[PDB]
Ligand binder design. Structure first.
Ligand code: W5P
Length: 167
């Protein structure tokens, strides 16, 4: 049993809810919240800017030190950093940004990072400002992630489309 509430079940391991991932984090304090990161961990808008704002910029300060030491992530890659006031850990995952020309095949690689964590609160990767058509992205999450993932989708019309459309 876990603390996630109101989520609708899609599969054995994937659950979905209309909610802001940041609000899901403050209430649940999950072990892992996933950030929709870029390779520079520059948390400017969407999931990353909203998560970072909720940490009072502590996520950005920590991320700048990580990049200064390690250099940029790979598209499709991830790193584990603090969850600050939102979660124990934040898994920063880089889905491909269609609005920068990145190979959408890298979306499966991105979601494979989730399998290193037994339970996660996450957004749909490469959705929103990353330019990623959402049905494919969900078909990839369900077909890739084997661990227990609680998806918070902020746009109700998109939630509606996905929940009303998931095969
Ligand atoms: F907005 C886009 C579209 C739907 C997905 N999405 C989010 N999903 C959950 N939580 C969120 N908080 C801030 C953004 C956000 C990004």
């Amino acid at each position: 049993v876990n603390s996630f509430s109101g989520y609708l079940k899609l599969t054995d391991n994937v659950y979905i809810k209309n909610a802001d991932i940041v609000e899901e984090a403050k209430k649940v304090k999950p072990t892992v919240v996933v950030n929709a990161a870029n390779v520079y961990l520059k948390h400017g808008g969407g999931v990353a800017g909203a998560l970072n704002k909720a940490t009072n910029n502590a996520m950005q300060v920590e991320s700048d030190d990580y990049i200064a030491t390690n250099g940029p992530l790979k598209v499709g890659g991830s790193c584990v950093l603090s969850g600050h006031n939102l979660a124990k850990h934040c898994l920063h995952v880089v889905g491909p940004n269609v609005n920068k020309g990145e190979d959408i095949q890298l979306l499966k690689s991105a979601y494979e990072n989730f399998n290193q964590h037994e339970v996660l609160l996450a957004p749909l990767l490469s959705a929103g400002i990353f330019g990623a058509d959402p049905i494919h992205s969900l078909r990839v999450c369900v077909d890739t992630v084997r661990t227990n993932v609680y998806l918070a989708v902020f746009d109700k019309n998109l939630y509606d489309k996905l929940v009303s459309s998931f095969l």
